[PDB]
Amino acid sequence: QGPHMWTISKEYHIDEEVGFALPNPQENLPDFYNDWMFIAKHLPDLIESGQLRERVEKLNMLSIDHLTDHKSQRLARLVLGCITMAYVWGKGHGDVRKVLPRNIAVPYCQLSKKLELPPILVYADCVLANWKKKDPNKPLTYENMDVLFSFRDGDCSKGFFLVSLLVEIAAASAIKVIPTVFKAMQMQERDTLLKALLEIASCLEKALQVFHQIHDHVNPKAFFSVLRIYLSGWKGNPQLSDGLVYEGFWEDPKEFAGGSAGQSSVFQCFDVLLGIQQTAGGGHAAQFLQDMRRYMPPAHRNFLCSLESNPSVREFVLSKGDAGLREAYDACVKALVSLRSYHLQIVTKYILIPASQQAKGTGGTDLMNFLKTVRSTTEKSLLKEG
Numbered sequence: 209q210g211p212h213m214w215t216i217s218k219e220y221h222i223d224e225e226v227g228f229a230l231p232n233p234q235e236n237l238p239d240f241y242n243d244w245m246f247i248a249k250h251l252p253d254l255i256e257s258g259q260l261r262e263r264v265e266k267l268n269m270l271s272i273d274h275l276t277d278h279k280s281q282r283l284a285r286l287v288l289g290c291i292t293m294a295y296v297w298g299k300g301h302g303d304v305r306k307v308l309p310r311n312i313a314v315p316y317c318q319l320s321k322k323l324e325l326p327p328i329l330v331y332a333d334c335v336l337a338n339w340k341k342k343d344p345n346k347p348l349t350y351e352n353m354d355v356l357f358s359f360r361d362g363d364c365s366k367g368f369f370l371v372s373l374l375v376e377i378a379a380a381s382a383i384k385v386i387p388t389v390f391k392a393m394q395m396q397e398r399d400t401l402l403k404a405l406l407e408i409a410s411c412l413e414k415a416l417q418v419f420h421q422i423h424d425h426v427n428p429k430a431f432f433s434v435l436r437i438y439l440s441g442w443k444g445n446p447q448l449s450d451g452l453v454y455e456g457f458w459e460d461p462k463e464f465a466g467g468s469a470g471q472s473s474v475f476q477c478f479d480v481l482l483g484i485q486q487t488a489g490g491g492h493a494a495q496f497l498q499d500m501r502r503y504m505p506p507a508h509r510n511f512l513c514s515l516e517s518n519p520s521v522r523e524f525v526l527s528k529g530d531a532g533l534r535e536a537y538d539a540c541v542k543a544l545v546s547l548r549s550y551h552l553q554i555v556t557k558y559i560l561i562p563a564s565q566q567a568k569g570t571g572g573t574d575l576m577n578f579l580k581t582v583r584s585t586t587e588k589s590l591l592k593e594g
């Protein structure tokens with residue numbers, strides 16, 4: 209019949225409440241994995257004391273066969289991924305391990321192959337599956353939430369991961385409007401389309417207000433001098449120029465990029481929907497965002513290329529000579545420009561200024577240039593405002 213997004217199929221694994229985030233993540237693994245759980249839950253103490261690497265090297269190789277459902281496999285990825293970052297970087301002062309012991313590398317790679325995700329911590333692990341409600345009968349607010357794992361005391365990982373998650377959830381409230389958009393275009397329902405675009409804009413405007421909470425829960429000194437170390441990967445990294453050896457799984461060292469919000473499917477989703485061709489051309493920013501799709505869960509990666517197969521919303525609006533429809537489309541693009549402009553100020557506070565008192569991103573190239581290119585591509589998609 210063809211690529212028609214008239215409904216969001218349950219096979220895309222997009223939750224009605226939390227969107228691309230993992231709904232009600234599992235907190236405990238079966239008892240068989242207690243040795244992994246003790247290490248993952250005590251990374252601040254084990255790293256600070258210099259005992260982390262020895263505790264990891266003492267592990268027996270545990271089979272992944274006892275992780276029988278999706279949520280336990282996602283929790284185990286988050287546990288193994290946090291342990292791997294702590295093992296590779298240690299205290300973060302130049303003494304790096306270039307070989308991941310087989311006792312963790314083998315189950316980590318087996319589980320990563322099973323979930324079609326690389327054997328490195330991704331945004332879907334440390335943001336989308338790394339959370340819980342303190343009280344299940346209370347709403348999804350910062351006060352009623354916590355992360356499952358942190359790297360070091362005072363690293364601000366709770367604030368950084370949770371505010372990223374909250375923004376991600378706020379933007380997700382617009383996903384349910386996508387089938388209304390495609391259906392209104394197919395059925396030539398102008399008023400329905402206009403109303404749907406304004407609702408998407410409203411959601412993206414609310415996501416910016418949610419972002420303001422970053423200042424209360426993250427401090428620049430801790431983010432840049434402490435958390436930054438554990439967010440780093442091994443692709444174009446001079447500290448691990450050939451990548452990491454996953455002992456017992458692969459013969460040669462392998463390179464994988466560190467976790468990135470370029471792996472967020474909700475932001476890539478609205479750029480695709482609005483025809484902001486962030487992945488077009490052969491430039492660095494476009495190549496990076498396309499590359500980050502292979503670091504997203506497979507159903508979410510599938511949702512994005514499915515959106516790309518649908519008719520263009522931008523081309524539909526551009527061809528109508530309808531001021532009301534063009535304004536509603538621009539309200540969506542404007543809300544993304546506003547988010548990106550505010551995020552540039554956040555990056556200046558949390559990265560640029562601390563770095564100046566001491567910038568390359570996950571892609572190995574200047575992060576300010578990447579962000580400004582992404583923002584500029586969005587601003588240039590406005591049909592009028594200039």
Ligand code: HEM
Pocket residue numbers: 368371372373375376419422426431467468469470472475548551554555558559568569570571575578579582583
């Ligand atoms: C302490 C605050 C923050 C800092 C320092 C920060 C830093 C960065 C950096 C360095 C990048 C470039 C990509 C990379 O190198 O991995 C990036 C991209 C991005 N960030 Fe953040 N970020 C912050 C907060 C947030 C929050 C709360 C969100 C909400 C989900 C967010 C969403 C994004 C998105 C979607 C991108 C991809 C580029 C774009 O779509 O404009 N960031 N961020």
Ligand SMILES: COc1cc(F)c(-n2cc([C@H](O)c3c(C4CC4)ncc4cncn34)nn2)cc1F
Pocket residue numbers: 330331334335368369372431432436439467468469470558559567568569570575
């Ligand atoms: C030179 O100094 C630095 C360079 C940097 F690249 C970073 N860095 C990288 C990320 C990453 O993209 C990220 C993540 C990941 C954990 C998955 N999660 C949420 C998020 C929101 N926006 C970005 N997010 N955030 N900061 C930090 C640095 F200090």
